[PDB]
Amino acid sequence: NNXXXXXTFXXXXGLXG
Ligand SMILES: *[C@H]1O[C@H](CO)[C@@H](O)[C@H](O)[C@@H]1O[C@H]1O[C@H](CO)[C@@H](O)[C@H](O)[C@@H]1O
Ligand SMILES: *C(=O)/C=C\C=C\CC(C)C
Numbered sequence: 001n002n003x004x005x006x007x008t009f010x011x012x013x014g015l016x017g
Contacts, residue, residue, distance in 0.1 A: 001013035009017035 001015060002017045003009060003011070003013040005011070
């Protein structure tokens, strides 16, 4: 789970994001 907020992939945390 990559992310932790917003950007290129979208918003939240989501398995290779
Ligand atoms: C994400 O958080 C909330 C979910 O209900 C809402 O305030 C908005 O949907 C918010 O979305 C933001 O991100 C998208 C791109 O991922 C933009 O299009 C929106 O304008 C907003 O900045
Ligand atoms: C979070 O992003 C951690 C691992 C992700 C692996 C990729 C997934 C198996 C498609």
